Amino acid sequence: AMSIDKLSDVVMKATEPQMVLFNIYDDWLDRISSYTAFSRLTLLLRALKTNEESAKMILLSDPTITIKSYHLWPSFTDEQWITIESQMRDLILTEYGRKYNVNISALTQTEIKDIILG
Amino acid sequence: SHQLGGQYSIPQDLRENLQKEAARIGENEKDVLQEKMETRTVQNREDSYHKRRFDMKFELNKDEKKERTLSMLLLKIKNGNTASRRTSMRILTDKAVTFGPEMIFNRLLPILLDRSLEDQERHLMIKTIDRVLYQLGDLTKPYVHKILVVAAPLLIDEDPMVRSTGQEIITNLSTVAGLKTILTVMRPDIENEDEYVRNVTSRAAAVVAKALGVNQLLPFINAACHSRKSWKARHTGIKIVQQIGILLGIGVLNHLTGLMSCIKDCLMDDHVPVRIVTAHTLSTLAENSYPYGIEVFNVVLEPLWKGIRSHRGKVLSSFLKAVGSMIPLMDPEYAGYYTTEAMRIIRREFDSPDDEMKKTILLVLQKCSAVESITPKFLREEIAPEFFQKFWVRRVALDRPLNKVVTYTTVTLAKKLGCSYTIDKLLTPLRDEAEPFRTMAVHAVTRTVNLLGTADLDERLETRLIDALLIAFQEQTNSDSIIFKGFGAVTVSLDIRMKPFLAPIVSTILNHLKHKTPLVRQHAADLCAILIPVIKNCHEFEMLNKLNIILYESLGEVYPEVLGSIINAMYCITSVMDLDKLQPPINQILPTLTPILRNKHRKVEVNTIKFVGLIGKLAPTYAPPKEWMRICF
Amino acid sequence: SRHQFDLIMCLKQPGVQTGLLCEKCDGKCPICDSYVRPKRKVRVCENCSFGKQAKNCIICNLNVGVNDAFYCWECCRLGKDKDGCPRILNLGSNRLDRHFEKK
Amino acid sequence: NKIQQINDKELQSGILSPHQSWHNEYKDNAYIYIGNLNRELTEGDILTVFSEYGVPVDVILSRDENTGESQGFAYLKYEDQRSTILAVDNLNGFKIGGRALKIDHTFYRPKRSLQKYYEAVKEELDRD
Amino acid sequence: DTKILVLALEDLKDVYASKVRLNASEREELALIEEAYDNPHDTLNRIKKYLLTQRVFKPVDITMMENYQNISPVYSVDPLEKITDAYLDQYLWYEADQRKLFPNWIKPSDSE
Amino acid sequence: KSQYIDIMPDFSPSGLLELESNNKEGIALKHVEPQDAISPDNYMDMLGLEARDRTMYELVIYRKNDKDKGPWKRYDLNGRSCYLVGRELGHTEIVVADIGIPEETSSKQHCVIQFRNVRGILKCYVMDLDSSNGTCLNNVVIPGARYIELRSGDVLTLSEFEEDNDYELIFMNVHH
Amino acid sequence: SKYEDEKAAEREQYLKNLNMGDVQKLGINVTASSLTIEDPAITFTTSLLGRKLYDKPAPENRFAIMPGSRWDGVHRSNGFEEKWFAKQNEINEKKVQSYTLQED
Amino acid sequence: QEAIQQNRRLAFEELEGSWDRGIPRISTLFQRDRHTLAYDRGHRIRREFKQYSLERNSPFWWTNSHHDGKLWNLNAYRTDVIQALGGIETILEHTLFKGTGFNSWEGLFWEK
Amino acid sequence: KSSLQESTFSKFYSILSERMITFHRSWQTAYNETFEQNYTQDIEDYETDQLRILGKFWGHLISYEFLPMDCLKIIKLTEEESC
Amino acid sequence: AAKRSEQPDLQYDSRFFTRGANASAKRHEDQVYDNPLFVQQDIESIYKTNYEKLDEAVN
Amino acid sequence: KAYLKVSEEEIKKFDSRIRGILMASGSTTFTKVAAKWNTSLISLFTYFREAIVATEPLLDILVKGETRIQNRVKLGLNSKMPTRFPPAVFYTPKELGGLGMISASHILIPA
Ligand SMILES: [Zn+2]
Ligand SMILES: [Zn+2]
Ligand SMILES: [Zn+2]
């Protein structure tokens, strides 16, 4: 979580012990159930946990898409999320292949889903 | 010219600028009805090559009534009601004799040369030539030239149904017009300059050869092949030997000595296009012969190698095809020598981008597995890895004529190579993105596993194979049998070993039966009928009753293609499993089927009647007899 | 064939290879075309073997063959068994004419 | 007409875009084998038809060392690859001078013996 | 000719694109339209021939649709005649609009 | 040091690529009509007047030995946007150009008669195709490779000098 | 032997690098108008690798590549490139038609 | 005028803004069958006389959405209603949605 | 904002404000102050389309004097300072 | 000297035509909306892993 | 200025249109009635757009029509209870499994 722009900006500056609310889902719960929202969220954290900078490249590619002043995550449409979940999905696999030096066509499908989900 | 108000639509002069374009651009467009107007006419099936049929050269008041009648009959047959032409065929077959065959053929044959006629209309005309030629029995030479102008171009036609009915004529005409007459008509035709006309009557004179026997026709070929007069007579005189060797199949043989007069001496010609043709006409005589021939092919084996060791180019592709197909009929002493000779050439030619060579490389690999001398270790170490990477490119999987070869070649190499080695290499294509390439790599696995059996596979490939199939199963789009037989030929082999893999598979069946697209609910149920004989061997009767109920609750489906295949899986579970322990149970199943017998279609009626009759055998006592009488009606 | 008159049988000396029938023509005697009471395997000549041709049903010679073909009991009593290769050569008037009309 | 046969099957299935297309097998290749040329067409004229689809950086026409006339094949590298996907696909089977030429993707290996022919060609294509 | 057909036949087919359970007359019509696509040239000759020779036609049925205040009549002609009427209609409008027959003022016109 | 390599490239046009676009069935023809090229009548149909108020154009031939017999031939120029001049002898020759002459000093493609639309005005021109012998207007030599503006009555001779001139070609603005 | 191997590797690299297309190798890729336009002030006032480019309007293309300065200007095509659009438009259309023609 | 004048290429980036604008709806210029529609003339009066020849009302008699393009879009209405009812979750407290046992409501499809 | 999402200018949002500006003088200061916030801060965001909806929206308010016109004082035309 | 083929008037970017322009007009009689409320229906698929790209990206 | 209103004939045509929607046949399935009311309604508001603001009788007839169709569904089951039929049942789009009927009739009507 600390690898996000906003949250680091708040936790670095604040000089007192304090509580701060955020809404992690921005406004995603208009068009998305809590289930799939939590699911995408954990995918956006797992790709930020591992690669970091190269995930943040996937998020911040197009500057035309802007993070609002309220939200954390940049405001996409539904389809842009459907592709970005696939890229953020890809970093976990390419990185896994880099780490254990396993060419990833050697894995069973279950092994892929497990890799993506831990 | 001031306007009142303004412009709100588009400027007025701009529409006409648009509506003029549609006249200019539209006349080149081929509108919907314009398209279907042409598609009807048979010429859209044909390449520029086949178009040459029309380039080919074709050359009282009481009796003026017969001149109409035939032209009326020939009209009724071609364009006529089905009850009309049926009466006008009966009139021809009886009365063909009394009408002048001049009048029939001079009137009948020109139709077949127009550019208009549809395929339905053409086959009704050819069927009249065949029925007329059968009777008269004495036919003059002028028409024998005409008939072959019409009939022979069929032999090159796209589809085999037309190819055969063309062949059916010439074998009838060959007997009618006799041996002496036809061989006079080919002589000026084989010396002809035009290519298409020569390619046509190689195939025509060969059909004549089978009907009358080749010996009667052999001195004709010997005159053409050995002819120093024309170069082209040598060429086409050699093609006549192919379509004699292709038609006569195995039976060439005893004639192979007389034929060899043509081939060898006509091979030495300085003209390469002749050099090349004989190199093919040997590979056909070599294969069609098979084990018996070699004693006649030693004479030709020497000049091939001096042609292989030098000329390269496309002469190398043809000579290797000949030498490649002599191998299996050589003695084990030499056969081991020439392959290890030829396997040097292939290793050098795997990088050849040409098609003509790749078709030759496959033939030799195909025939060099059966040689004892190469070890299966040599293949795995060298030939195998340079095979699967070059011949399994996605550009291969698209065109069928080169797919059937690469899979057959793969399957034969699977006897020397391990079963675990080939299946190991076929996992990259089974998971590939391209559809037509996943289907190719399935045919190679189904075919392989039937030969070798799955006992070879270490546990890891056994798990990776099934993951590759389920994937390649669940992305299929088009409906084809190959995935199901394949996924069903794997299970049958390893069946008791399947048990751990059978839990997650059945979960995806139950997951795809909830999918919206009705194709996916076919393949979900089509893959249950396959797994039942394997599930029972693994002895899950708690896992059949789960499938069975789920197939029962879906038995009121709308889509007939889907409802049919669910009953099919119901019929597989019921016959396999005990009746007494069937979960629904039976007495609740049978009354649900009787209103399904009214479902029209077929997939539902067939698969149901097999299910109902099953219960008549196995459990008659459940439904009361007035229920069986509701079924008998 | 028993009911389709144009088709021409082979009638050559039977070899050692067994004829095959497609799933659709399966269970039929190649002579009388009856589904009942088989007796003897069919045996076809070599010159009906060779390449692609060998696989096709010995009745329609179009579809690919799978099961063996038997002579029915009645065709083995009369002797029509041993006349020759019981294989149909041409595709016949009926099959063609359906084909062109459909397209 | 071998390749032209594929794309019709391929497109019919709606394959659309290179990942699923057989043209993806290459990606690192640019030169295209240009076959069944007529005999009199020279490098400049082969550098007519093929700029429709891209910008050629290189060209080589294959011609006998002695008489110096066309063998009938050439190797033409486009600046941006995807021209290759475009030329192979679109212009294959097309008539020039009565004979329909063939294109296909190729890996091209230079031959020492032509070394000067490279600068002699390059200098012209280096003009632009 | 073929284009004016395409327009006519599509105008006729849009009626049955929606319909669900078809009566017999409908099936008859749809048969005529499908045949009109399968032989455009034949049906053009049929049309033009009817434009010459045929001066006596089949009868025309009437029903009334209720608008609850108005009651309005509705004429159903036979499909064989519907096709020639359609082609003839489309053609006359194409020419008459092409040759500037009707002046500007007449107007449930095409532009607005 | 004798030659770099005996082979070397070309970078020269073959006649095949240019030829296919242009056919005289036998041969290629120079001069693709400029974009404003329009046949006169279709320019006259733009200005919409039935033939009495139209301008017409005929190219009349007078054999330069004797003009007293009147027209040798009369060629109407209102039909096409361009017209080609060449050699049709009658005594074998292939017919290429629109307007042929029985002149043995005239090349197969000699001079071109082109009509254009320049700011709403039809203007016929003439250009030498750089034929072997050259061409003359008003019996004055003309430069090649430009459209020279024809003016009513002017004469077109097929050769650079009077010695070879057997024929006169006259361009006509036609009214009243 | 090692040296030889190295040499071989180098030549392979050279072969591959020569073959690679130029734009990919440098690669890295593949409103304003409105404003700069809808603006009164404006009124007051070609190759990716710099290679020569054509002038007149070219036929449209899948990738939008522009013909080289040397192009004669004749269409030469098998006719495929236009047939890909028809499929491209089709597939893109039946994604819309499928929902809109749905009923119940 | 600009493009014809400088021989440039309309980019679709420029004119995508107005893609849905205009009473003929700019997008109707780029229809697939436009070539065959240029021959359909008198369509307005054909639609207004379908009163007489057909029983079924097609309540849009004033538009052919082939020629004119679709003159309205209510897409936004559907979302704004959905949040006027309290969102998709409170809407689905009133249903069997949980009975089915699906996890998420996002991809539900009703048999058509 | 809900005026700018609407794809074209409408008389609804004009009269909605007109009826509102005349209700109480506290809404006089709400539009006067939000015509400054738009022109200064919030013009930097907008597409060339949504400026066509604003232009007409402050057109009816100024030309009917609801604004009034001295609130247009902030507009300054220079090469140096103008967006 | 070679003759140009005709290009009509302005020409247009290819994305004009391939966009499936007025496709919404082959609407059923009574379908008010032209898009599904949710992409996830129209998308036809979510995540299909590509074994070819990953194998390139890993090595 | 051109002031606009809907003519009284084409108000009566609309009212009679709905009247026909209720007796039409196939009216009883809830979704076909709601779809028919949708199309009719969209034909109106789309043809007369601006004019509808200034006509009272048209608004009154809208309020009658929409309640009459909702009553069609309610009487279709057996209740007029408000508690059973919260507005989500009529107004949720068909993609979430309601009628998706499109309400122009809430408003407030100038008196
Ligand atoms: Zn059979
Ligand atoms: Zn029998
Ligand atoms: Zn036999």
mmCIF file of C-alpha atoms in Angstrom, chain J:
data_model
loop_
_atom_site.group_PDB
_atom_site.id
_atom_site.type_symbol
_atom_site.label_atom_id
_atom_site.label_comp_id
_atom_site.label_asym_id
_atom_site.label_seq_id
_atom_site.Cartn_x
_atom_site.Cartn_y
_atom_site.Cartn_z
ATOM 1 C CA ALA J 1 5.210 9.032 -67.717
ATOM 2 C CA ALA J 2 3.131 6.241 -66.165
ATOM 3 C CA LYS J 3 -0.547 6.919 -65.580
ATOM 4 C CA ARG J 4 -1.866 7.377 -62.051
ATOM 5 C CA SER J 5 -4.880 5.481 -60.883
ATOM 6 C CA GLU J 6 -7.762 7.620 -59.692
ATOM 7 C CA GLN J 7 -8.246 8.429 -56.029
ATOM 8 C CA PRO J 8 -11.604 10.038 -55.412
ATOM 9 C CA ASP J 9 -11.544 13.631 -54.195
ATOM 10 C CA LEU J 10 -10.343 14.049 -50.582
ATOM 11 C CA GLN J 11 -10.012 10.393 -49.560
ATOM 12 C CA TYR J 12 -10.564 9.425 -45.936
ATOM 13 C CA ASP J 13 -8.792 7.844 -43.028
ATOM 14 C CA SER J 14 -9.528 4.170 -42.826
ATOM 15 C CA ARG J 15 -11.028 4.431 -39.370
ATOM 16 C CA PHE J 16 -14.062 6.182 -40.876
ATOM 17 C CA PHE J 17 -15.244 3.039 -42.604
ATOM 18 C CA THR J 18 -14.058 0.245 -40.361
ATOM 19 C CA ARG J 19 -15.861 1.803 -37.376
ATOM 20 C CA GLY J 20 -19.121 0.088 -38.371
ATOM 21 C CA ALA J 21 -20.685 3.465 -38.776
ATOM 22 C CA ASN J 22 -24.459 3.470 -38.507
ATOM 23 C CA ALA J 23 -24.637 -0.155 -37.340
ATOM 24 C CA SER J 24 -27.021 0.804 -34.550
ATOM 25 C CA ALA J 25 -29.736 1.300 -37.184
ATOM 26 C CA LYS J 26 -30.356 -2.444 -37.786
ATOM 27 C CA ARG J 27 -32.008 -2.297 -34.416
ATOM 28 C CA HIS J 28 -34.947 -4.508 -33.487
ATOM 29 C CA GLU J 29 -38.327 -2.762 -33.421
ATOM 30 C CA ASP J 30 -38.180 -2.072 -29.712
ATOM 31 C CA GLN J 31 -34.708 -1.964 -28.265
ATOM 32 C CA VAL J 32 -34.250 1.378 -26.570
ATOM 33 C CA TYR J 33 -30.541 1.097 -25.846
ATOM 34 C CA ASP J 34 -27.652 0.374 -28.164
ATOM 35 C CA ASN J 35 -25.094 -0.903 -25.637
ATOM 36 C CA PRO J 36 -25.127 -3.588 -23.001
ATOM 37 C CA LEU J 37 -25.102 -2.022 -19.530
ATOM 38 C CA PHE J 38 -21.991 -4.064 -18.823
ATOM 39 C CA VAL J 39 -18.850 -4.553 -20.894
ATOM 40 C CA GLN J 40 -18.330 -7.977 -19.387
ATOM 41 C CA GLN J 41 -21.119 -9.293 -21.595
ATOM 42 C CA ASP J 42 -19.884 -7.674 -24.767
ATOM 43 C CA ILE J 43 -16.219 -8.512 -24.133
ATOM 44 C CA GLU J 44 -16.751 -12.210 -24.924
ATOM 45 C CA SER J 45 -13.654 -13.060 -22.815
ATOM 46 C CA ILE J 46 -11.661 -11.760 -19.884
ATOM 47 C CA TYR J 47 -8.171 -13.229 -19.500
ATOM 48 C CA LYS J 48 -6.696 -15.726 -21.916
ATOM 49 C CA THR J 49 -3.052 -16.169 -21.044
ATOM 50 C CA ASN J 50 -0.639 -15.966 -23.971
ATOM 51 C CA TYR J 51 2.112 -18.497 -23.597
ATOM 52 C CA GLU J 52 4.066 -17.053 -26.527
ATOM 53 C CA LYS J 53 4.560 -13.493 -25.304
ATOM 54 C CA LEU J 54 5.412 -14.502 -21.765
ATOM 55 C CA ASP J 55 8.054 -16.934 -22.977
ATOM 56 C CA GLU J 56 9.608 -14.102 -24.980
ATOM 57 C CA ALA J 57 9.288 -11.603 -22.148
ATOM 58 C CA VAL J 58 10.790 -13.955 -19.579
ATOM 59 C CA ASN J 59 13.870 -14.954 -21.564
#
